[PDB]
Amino acid sequence: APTWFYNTTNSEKLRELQHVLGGSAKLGYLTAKVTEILDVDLETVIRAKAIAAYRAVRVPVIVEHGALCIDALNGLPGALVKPFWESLDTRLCEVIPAGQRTARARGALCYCDGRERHVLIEETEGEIAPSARGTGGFHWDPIFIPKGQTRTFAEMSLDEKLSFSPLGRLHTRLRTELGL
């Protein structure tokens, strides 16, 4: 039986974390739906998301929340990235001026055992594409190009995306600190 449970309602995040942390027999999976607080800071939202997901499932839980801070929007959306891609789908490439397309793709894991909340944060420099390209992946992957690379997260496979994305450095930190 598992001792840690990764809670997400997003079935595309589920197949990413099962691609690397899938063979760990100490990790279970839950699908409880939580409501995030209104703040652009990633550290504040992921810390209030774990206390709201432990209250739902009542087991040692691991939650995940991201950020897409943009220099042209002075850090917006930040942790408000979920309603931007709902509203501005590929017009988000158009509302940003050409010449200052730089942005940061941040991502955070927070595991709560019922007594303590520990936040792991990784981060990837990049720049917003001039137009959306690529088919693979999911939300905002056709618009983000990492630094040095020419391609998007959507144009790369799941092994190649996790060699650039924040989750590929968060697998090893979550496995080491939890013994998965």
Binding site: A1, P2, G28, Y29, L30, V57, V59
Partner: peptide, 11 residues
């Protein structure tokens, strides 16, 4: 109160 807890699989 001499009550032991049996942890069942929550999945």
């Amino acid at each position: 109160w001499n009550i032991d807890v049996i942890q069942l699989d929550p999945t």
